[PDB]
Amino acid sequence: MREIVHIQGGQCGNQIGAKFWEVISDEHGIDPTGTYHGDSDLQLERINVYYNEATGGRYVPRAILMDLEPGTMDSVRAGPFGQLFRPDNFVFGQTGAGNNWAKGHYTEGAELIDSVLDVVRKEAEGCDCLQGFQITHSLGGGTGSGMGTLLISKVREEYPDRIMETFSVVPSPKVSDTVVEPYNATLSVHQLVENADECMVIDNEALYDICFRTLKLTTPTYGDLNHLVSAAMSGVTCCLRFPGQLNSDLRKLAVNLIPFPRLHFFMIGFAPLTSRGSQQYRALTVPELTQQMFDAKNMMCAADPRHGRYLTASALFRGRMSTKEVDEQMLNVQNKNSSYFVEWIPNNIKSSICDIPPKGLKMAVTFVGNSTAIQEMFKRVAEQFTAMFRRKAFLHWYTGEGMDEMEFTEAESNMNDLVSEYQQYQDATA
Amino acid sequence: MSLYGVGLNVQVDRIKTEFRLYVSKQKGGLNVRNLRRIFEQLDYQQNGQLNLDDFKAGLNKFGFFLKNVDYQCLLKYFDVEQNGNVNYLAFLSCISQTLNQRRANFVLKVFDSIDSEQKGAVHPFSLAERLEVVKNKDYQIGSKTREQLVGEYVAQFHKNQDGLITRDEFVSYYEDLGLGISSDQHFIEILQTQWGIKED
Amino acid sequence: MREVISIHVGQGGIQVGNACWELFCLEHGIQPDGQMPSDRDDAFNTFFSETGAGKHVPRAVFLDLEPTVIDEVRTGTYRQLFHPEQLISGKEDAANNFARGHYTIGKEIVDLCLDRIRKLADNCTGLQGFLVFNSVGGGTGSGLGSLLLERLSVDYGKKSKLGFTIYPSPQVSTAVVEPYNSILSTHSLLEHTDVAVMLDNEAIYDICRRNLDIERPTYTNLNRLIAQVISSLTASLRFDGALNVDITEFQTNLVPYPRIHFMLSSYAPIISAEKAYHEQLSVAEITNSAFEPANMMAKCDPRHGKYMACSMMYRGDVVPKDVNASIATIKTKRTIQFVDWCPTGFKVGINYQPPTVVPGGDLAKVMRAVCMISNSTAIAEVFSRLDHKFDLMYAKRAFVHWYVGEGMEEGEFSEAREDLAALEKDYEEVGIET
Amino acid sequence: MREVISIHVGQGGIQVGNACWELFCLEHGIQPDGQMPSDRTIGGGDDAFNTFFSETGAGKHVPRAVFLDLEPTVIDEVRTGTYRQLFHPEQLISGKEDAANNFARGHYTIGKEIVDLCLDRIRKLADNCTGLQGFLVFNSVGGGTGSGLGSLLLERLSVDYGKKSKLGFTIYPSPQVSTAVVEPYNSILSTHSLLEHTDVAVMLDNEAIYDICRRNLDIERPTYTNLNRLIAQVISSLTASLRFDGALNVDITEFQTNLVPYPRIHFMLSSYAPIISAEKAYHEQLSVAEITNSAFEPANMMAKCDPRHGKYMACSMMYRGDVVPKDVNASIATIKTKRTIQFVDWCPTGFKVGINYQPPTVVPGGDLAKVMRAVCMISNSTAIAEVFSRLDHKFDLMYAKRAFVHWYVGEGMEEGEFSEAREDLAALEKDYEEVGIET
Amino acid sequence: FELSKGPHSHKDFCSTFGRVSTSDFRKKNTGTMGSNKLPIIKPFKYAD
Amino acid sequence: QYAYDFNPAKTQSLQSRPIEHNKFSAWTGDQLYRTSYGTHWTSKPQEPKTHVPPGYA
Amino acid sequence: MKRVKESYFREHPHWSDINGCSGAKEFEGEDLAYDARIKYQKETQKQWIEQQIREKKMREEAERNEERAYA
Amino acid sequence: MKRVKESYFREHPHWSDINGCSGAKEFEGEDLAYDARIKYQKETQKQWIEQQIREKKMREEAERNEERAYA
Ligand SMILES: Nc1nc2c(ncn2[C@@H]2O[C@H](COP(=O)(O)OP(=O)(O)OP(=O)(O)O)[C@@H](O)[C@H]2O)c(=O)[nH]1
Ligand SMILES: Nc1nc2c(ncn2[C@@H]2O[C@H](COP(=O)(O)OP(=O)(O)OP(=O)(O)O)[C@@H](O)[C@H]2O)c(=O)[nH]1
Ligand SMILES: Nc1nc2c(ncn2[C@@H]2O[C@H](COP(=O)(O)OP(=O)(O)O)[C@@H](O)[C@H]2O)c(=O)[nH]1
Ligand SMILES: [Mg+2]
Ligand SMILES: [Mg+2]
């Protein structure tokens, strides 16, 4: 009954998935042994969206973890909440990706995806009414970006009607974490633009900014960064699992956010976020939430949205609140900032309300917005890619698996015309 | 909803006031003192413990209905010994107003006017006589069975071992009646008219 | 012997039905369990039905494609009241898509509702008509709503159908694609609804803020106000009164022509108890407040147009000689002007049952109340505003792939604009003086 | 003084006869041991049980039934259970080797060594009776021994007795759901056999009753016991008028005189009302008007067939409980008023109504609810051509290349039987199309 | 008779156990989610 | 005042919680239980037979 | 077959009850027992509904126990 | 619908109460208790106003305790 299955790949994908399943389990009151210990009934009615059932009343997530090296899944199994996952859901090789898109997409993932496609196929038919898929992977790596995109294409060929949502960690060159990341980044986007229904880009530089300027904590770690993504990940589907004044699912958010099919790249943000030494002075009211929600520095991407026009925005509120202020605040912010919104669509903000706030908080909000300012990261990646590809640097590694430069040429254009067409809507007038 | 921390405390308070309006709205024969009497029947062994199914039956028989998630909230808060049984005695100890100070004046002064012997205990028959006189002008002093026939006006409360009405239970009976009526002026109107004493 | 059947479709229809069916149960004394408390006047026959073995079940059907809101009705305090198989729910939401709820997942569920409707109709003997509730700015609200009314026209025909739609507010709203499914809905319900009432939300926000003294209103507050309008409208069907008016005696006195049946409502007195301690709540004044454009329940100003017909109902302790005096004063004031060809334009009904109050509500208990249903040419402004928003966005063909890809031809919008466009032309031509 | 002999063949016939006989015993107040309970010591009057039972001259009652099979497991289970003291020891005829889903085996090789014993027992049951109304036969048709022995018994009974009535409650295969893979063959052959030897045939496919149990009784995992209970209730409602007082009485002979327009047309489908679970049983009032409206509902047809695709020929409804003829007449008028139900041109009046007073009985551990009113329908319509039409395609697909034909040929059946069976089926199809057209 | 089916349907060739090059790839807009181009318009009647 | 804990309600692992014992037959109170008859009058396995009719096979 | 009850509810009256009925003024078909009979039928139905609900709840619990043991 | 009451305030009179009224001298429309009825209605309205004000104040305090706890 509109349940979604979760599939993740790569080191970044596995680490993010590890923190996400811990967050969801606490929301529904699931112990590390898989036994329900909730206190109300609202925490059990919609538990089948993310959890299966077995003998003894225990629940197992319908998650699938894939990698070309069992090194990453080695650490996740020994951590807390590691016994929740099915042993049969782990699919791995024994060679490795090599930070090479070609290896993860033509010579290693291709021969390995037969087994994982069987696992996801078993999960898809078992559920009552499949609602869609969600993806967590990084575009800067080999097995995540390479084999991940191949699975995206393969799944779409068998379920063309179900929804497909992705969480992509696109590389910001400031964290030059891989010298050959421009090759993988531009090749993954070209594959991603044709199949994925919704995409949500995430940047490590933005996450460092949040942990440093907003939370004001001295020593950030990937544990903290992964939790920020996990908190936003649950917010987009919170209304699907709990009652609310207005109900909204993945399909409803997509329908109200994508004017044209090729324009399906968003940015996400979460609020409230306050430091330990600064929440003594702040007040918890709806105007405060919408003030931090639209702040430029709060976005989880390196793209600054004050250089472009919001094509469309979406907000999902949590907790008990008055509907009037929710509709009033969105109208108020839309009028005072008429230069930051495109003009040929009136009232381009969607609102939804859920009655169950996150544990420990009384109010919350998750922001998903389609802004034309995201073209600036594609421009930066493309210009770096054409600089490296002009001299054919690092090319022999990709060509060694039979990959031809014609595919590289086509990857540039599809990214290029994406930027060109996505820019003229900023200058469009009515 | 989301009764993690103080959510449990605030969720019960909504039920505490929601019960009060329902009892106040009817304004008629429904009294909170019937709840303690109706729960004793289901308790059987005078344990003081009731499970969810029997607790729901008593409330619904009284005419008070809530949601399924609402009933679970009451059980978690009021299960002090963690045995899966709610404490109806603890539940009835709450949601009960103490009585306002001005209401205390009328309750005591009505008692004191009848209690002219200063002993603090009033013969139940004396209440029966004055309650009928204020209702009919042709009652006449003499009656055939003035004790039993007119005694139906009293004995709704309970007496001590001596049979005399203790003042402590005299105010206890009247304070519980002061839940179905939220209009203090109407509480004034009922008491002064039905007892024929008005002074404030 | 006289009954009505209520149709609730969409989240707006169902969530309003929760407020309406709370009032009806308490007004007639029905418990949430369905049993009669009092030992104990067949006034409940209009809305409830005697199912024999004890309880009473309503003559209502709830329709939705998402089971989230329906589960609350099956779990809330009224779980034991409604029949288990009259709460029809799907599996997938229409997702703000008119085409999805009208062409793809409409046929799979519209058959279940028709089967349920027939059984309810066969029970009734003198069925007056149908009442439908739907939110125009939604998927299943506009999608299934059009499909049901289109199908209901040929299934029954001469039976009257009344509608209480919710058009989007001039500027404040929830969805962003709502102009598309709002135009297509009006393009359907024009030729399939006998009487339609505009119930946009922004007007109700102003009323609650101005009168009830509430700084944080919620949809529960709005639904209680709307349920009052329904109760007063149908009060004369079950309670004795000096002047009785039925459902059939509305369109016989309130629609000049079949094409013109769009109306805007009002209600009075709408006052909080704190400031009800000062005003005198006379018959003469509550009808004066009913004509105030700020108190109107739809965001339209009648001062920009003419009144064609005016149906207004009193309940409480009104006296007909007091009503006649008030009508004379209304005709005197110049700022209210009627159309030329309507020398008399008032239909008045009187009921004796005073309005009932919902516990936990905010309206003050009073012995007098009046409900207003007005037909005026000023309602052409809301269509003009909706036309501008639709044409503005449709110029660049946005969001249209999600409508073409569900089997809906692209030519729907062209005819929907033409159908709407002719409507203003008719409304302006009627008001021209001869 | 009026009796009916029940014939049960095959696993389906036996497993439906079990429910039928437990229901009859509980209805007439006979303990499984075969005698009335010892608590009631007032002697005895009644005698209504004489239709189904017979006094043995010392105490207990013996049913007028016979059980038949070639696989002894089910019959051994019958004679091992708590009903071992009720049935006569040697009216439970059992063979040695089952036909194993082979019509030729069950009709030409094995059944001929048991038909003689069966007819001997039938004579021993018939000579005892004096007012024999007819025979009731139950059979699953997609099974080898079932179809074969049913065909052979009907063939031999048609000449042993002649004009005595026979009623067949066959169970044809569902449109898509089935257990075996070869059932179209013997289904067609059995259809040929029973075309010329049955007076009334009732359609009892399994998918329709599965749908009834799922939608109405709210049972997510039904089993054959529920199916048998429903069929037993149908049989009881059909035969109730023969053994209880009523305001309007109908005999067995008053089915083939008011439901059979022509001798060739005797295939008809049934329905029952009300079938409602106790959670919502009498949270709807279940008046006579609505129960007779639900009796006409296409989804409640006990055969998977929609009457909207054809015209009605005749109707036969039996009410039991506290119904009233004036309410029945009002309901009939309303049904005639409704337009989605239409009758054939040459049948201006098409209803025969019978009223019985004994309310339906309830079996412990059942699913239905205790009701004071009930209606059972037997309707004949042109829509019955659907099951023949869809069954035709299945046979041709696997017969165009002689699949499984060697199994049937090697058992002594001529190869030419298939073509003539198909020709008779096609001729049967043409009859229903020609009758329904307007003049 | 027909029962036209929409989004999900219930029949597939190899849904359960289907599984038994570098030159070919997705070129520009063969994907479902791309290709911002729309078909031609028809008059429609709606009068029926 | 204290950090974040994982296990709620203090549920000890079945690994160390007592030991195995002869309850392997916990479900098999009805495992040789027949339902062709059965589920018709009784819910328990049938008692051993003592009498049989002729032709019991 | 038999027709011994003129209706399911009331049987044939004693011969002393029909003192007149030669002139058609007393018909005995006007009930005068309709309302109370219907009312009583209501509770007689409700008791059966309660009994069946309790029985099915017991059956469901018995069904659950065996799965709990198999675990 | 029906009209069983002449007005909302007074019901139909007893048949012996209308002794004359053949000649138009009594009409029962002159009231003569109008002022007292209005005076009593004033207090009946005031009681409801006070009750609802008390209920609203209690609700407001219950709402304030919410923030008081969350802080
Ligand atoms: N006045 C009022 N309007 C409501 C209420 N609930 C929903 N709405 C209206 O409904 C519109 C959005 O549609 P939804 O209620 O979310 O659901 P829907 O109309 O059934 O459409 P779907 O989401 O596709 O199911 C909003 O613009 C609201 O105006 C309510 O309680 N009161
Ligand atoms: N409704 C119902 N159908 C049954 C039942 N038992 C068997 N059937 C049907 O009978 C068909 C197979 O024939 P059976 O009766 O089982 O076997 P048979 O008639 O003895 O023939 P053989 O297998 O050769 O011995 C199955 O496809 C079922 O549909 C039953 O108890 N109830
Ligand atoms: N947010 C986040 N990013 C990570 C994490 N681990 C790795 N990354 C990012 O992923 C990139 C490298 O990805 P990689 O490990 O090669 O992916 P793989 O090849 O699929 O395993 C680096 O730029 C990191 O910034 C993590 O736990 N959280
Ligand atoms: Mg919705
Ligand atoms: Mg067999």
Q: What is the DSSP letter of A372?
A: G
Say whether residue A260 is in contact with chain C using an 8 A CB cutoff.
Answer: yes
Residue of A nearest to G68 (CA): A56
What phi-psi label fits residue E23: left (phi over 0), alpha (psi between -120 and 50 degrees) or beta? alpha
Q: What is the dihedral of CA D173, D178, D182, D186, to 10 degrees?
A: -20
Q: Taking each helix axis from N to C terminus, what angle separates D72-80 and D10-28, rounded to the nearest 10 degrees?
A: 20
Residue with tokens 């599996």: C91
| Residues pairing with C62 in the sheet | C8, C87
A423 in a known ligand binding site: no
Number of H helices, E strands in chain B: 9, 2
CA A246–ligand 1 middle distance (angstroms): 7
Distance CA C155, CA D82 (A): 55
Give yes or no for a contact between H52 and C273, defined as CB atoms under 8 angstroms apart: yes
Quick one: tokens of C41? Answer: 């006047």
From the list C219, C19, C209, the residue with the least C-alpha distance to A322 is C219
Residues of F in contact with G70 (CB under 8 A): 26-27
Give yes or no for a contact between D9 and D150, defined as CB atoms under 8 angstroms apart: yes
Experimental structure resolution, Å: 3.7
Buried b (16+ CB within 10 A) or exposed e, D49-66: bbbbbbeeeeebbbbbbb
CA H54–ligand 5 middle distance (angstroms): 79
Residue nearest to atom 15 of ligand 3 (CA): A11
CA triple A53-A55-A57, angle to 5 deg: 60
Q: Do C and F touch, counting CB pairs below 8 Å (3 needed)?
A: no
Q: Do D and B touch, counting CB pairs below 8 Å (3 needed)?
A: no
Distance CA C218, CA D311 (A): 56
Q: How far apart are the first and last CA of chain C?
A: 45
Distance CA C203, CA C226 (A): 12
Give yes or no for a contact between D87 and D166, defined as CB atoms under 8 angstroms apart: no
- Whether residue D146 has its Cβ less than 6 Å from ligand 2: yes
ω into residue C302 within 30 of 0, thus cis? Answer: no
Distance CA D184, CA C89 (A): 39
CA C417–ligand 4 middle distance (angstroms): 26
Distance of CA A279 to the CA centre of its chain: 28
DSSP code per residue over C412-425: HHHHHHHHHHHHHH
| Residues pairing with C164 in the sheet | C133, C197
Give yes or no for a contact between C286 and C269, defined as CB atoms under 8 angstroms apart: yes
Distance CA A300, CA A289 (A): 16
* Cβ contacts of F36-44, under 8 Å, gap ≥ 24: F36/D15, F36/D74, F36/D77, F37/D18, F37/D77, F37/D78, F37/D80, F37/D81, F37/D82, F37/D83, F39/D225, F39/D365, F40/D18, F40/D22, F40/D225, F40/D365, F41/D32, F41/D82, F41/D365, F43/G62
Residues of F in contact with D225 (CB under 8 A): 39-40
Cβ separation of C84 and D280 shorter than 8 Å?
A: yes
Q: How many CB atoms lie within 10 A of CB A222?
A: 13
Quick one: tokens of D175? Answer: 């449109």
From the list A310, A296, A308, the residue with the least C-alpha distance to A345 is A310
ω into residue D222 within 30 of 0, thus cis? Answer: no
C66 in a known ligand binding site: yes
Residue nearest to atom 7 of ligand 1 (CA): C12
Largest CA distance in chain E: 54
Distance of CA B191 to the CA centre of its chain: 16
Number of H helices, E strands in chain H: 1, 0
Q: What is the DSSP letter of C47?
A: T
- Whether residue D51 has its Cβ less than 6 Å from ligand 2: no
Give yes or no for a contact between C56 and C1, defined as CB atoms under 8 angstroms apart: no
From the list A70, A72, A71, A35, the residue with the least C-alpha distance to A51 is A35
What phi-psi label fits residue D81: left (phi over 0), alpha (psi between -120 and 50 degrees) or beta? beta
Of C31, C32, C360, the CB nearest to B21: C360
In sequence order, which ranges of A137-179 are alpha helices (DSSP H)? 142, 148-158
Residue nearest to atom 21 of ligand 2 (CA): D143
CA D99–ligand 5 middle distance (angstroms): 7
Q: Give C391's Cβ-side CA count (13 Å radius).
A: 11
Ligand lying nearest the CA atom of residue C101: 1
Q: How many CB atoms lie within 10 A of CB E18?
A: 12
From the list A84, A36, A75, A85, the residue with the least C-alpha distance to A56 is A36
Q: How far is CA C89 from CA A45, C151, D275, in A?
A: 16, 19, 23
Give yes or no for a contact between D199 and D165, defined as CB atoms under 8 angstroms apart: yes
Q: Do C and D touch, counting CB pairs below 8 Å (3 needed)?
A: yes
For chain A, give every domain's residue range.
Answer: 3-256, 265-374
Q: How far is C259 from chain H (nearest CA, A)?
A: 31
Q: How far is B183 from chain H (nearest CA, A)?
A: 5
A414 in a known ligand binding site: no
Per CATH, A3-256 and A265-374 having the same topology is answered: no
Distance CA A302, CA A309 (A): 16
Of the options 2.70.50.60, 3.40.50.300, 2.40.30.10, 3.30.1330.20, the CATH number for the domain spanning A265-374? 3.30.1330.20
Quick one: tokens of C321? Answer: 């000689």
Residue nearest to atom 23 of ligand 3 (CA): A177
Q: How far is B69 from chain C (nearest CA, A)?
A: 9
Q: How far is CA D362 from CA D52, D232, D368, F38, G48, in A?
A: 19, 11, 8, 18, 11
Residue of C nearest to H42 (CA): C280
CA C133–ligand 4 middle distance (angstroms): 15
Quick one: tokens of A355? Answer: 């009655």
Distance CA A7, CA A135 (A): 6
A412 in a known ligand binding site: no
CA D363–ligand 4 middle distance (angstroms): 45
- What share of residues in chain D are helix, strand, coil (percent, to 5)? 40, 15, 40
Residue of H nearest to B188 (CA): H47
| Cβ partners under 8 Å of residue D249, min gap 6 | D241, D354, G1, G3
Residue of G nearest to C52 (CA): G42
Residue of B nearest to C357 (CA): B25
For residue C249, indicate whether it is catalytic. Answer: yes
| Residues pairing with A136 in the sheet | A8, A167
Distance CA B177, CA B168 (A): 15
Ligand lying nearest the CA atom of residue C68: 4
Buried b (16+ CB within 10 A) or exposed e, G40-71: eebeebeebbeebeeeeeeeeeeeeeeeeeee
Q: How far is C169 from chain H (nearest CA, A)?
A: 30
From the list B22, A29, C220, the residue with the least C-alpha distance to B14 is B22
Of G1, G9, G53, the CB nearest to D278: G53
ω into residue D274 within 30 of 0, thus cis? Answer: yes
To test ligand 3's pocket by mutation, which of A11, A19, A75, A176 has the most ligand atoms within 8 angstroms of CB? A11
Burial (CB count within 10 angstroms: exposed 0-12, middle 13-18, buried 19+), residue B101: exposed
Domain A3-256: give its CATH code.
3.40.50.1440
Give yes or no for a contact between C254 and C375, defined as CB atoms under 8 angstroms apart: yes
Distance CA D50, CA D44 (A): 13
Q: Which of D155, D254, D290, D429 is catalytic?
A: D254
Residue with tokens 């009904």: C349
Give yes or no for a contact between C256 and C431, defined as CB atoms under 8 angstroms apart: no
Q: How far is CA A281 from CA A276, A319, B28, C38, in A?
A: 10, 22, 50, 56
A142 in a known ligand binding site: yes
Lining ligand 3 with CB less than 6 A are A 10-12, 15-16, 97, 99, 138, 140-144, 169, 171, 175, 177, 204, 222, 225-226
* Cβ contacts of C420-425, under 8 Å, gap ≥ 24: C420/C183, C420/C186, C420/C187, C420/C383, C420/C386, C420/C387, C421/C387, C423/C190, C423/C259, C423/C380, C423/C383, C424/C380, C424/C383, C424/C384, C424/C387
Residues of A in contact with B84 (CB under 8 A): none
Of A195, A404, A414, the CB nearest to E33: A195
Say whether residue H62 is in contact with chain C using an 8 A CB cutoff.
Answer: no
Distance CA C258, CA C190 (A): 10
Give yes or no for a contact between B121 and B198, defined as CB atoms under 8 angstroms apart: no
Distance CA C238, CA C42 (A): 8
Ion ligand 5: residues, CB within 5 A, are: D 11, 71, 98
Ligand lying nearest the CA atom of residue A138: 3
Say how many CB pairs under 8 Å bridge D and F.
41
Say whether residue F11 is in contact with chain A using an 8 A CB cutoff.
Answer: yes
Quick one: tokens of A23? Answer: 């967050």
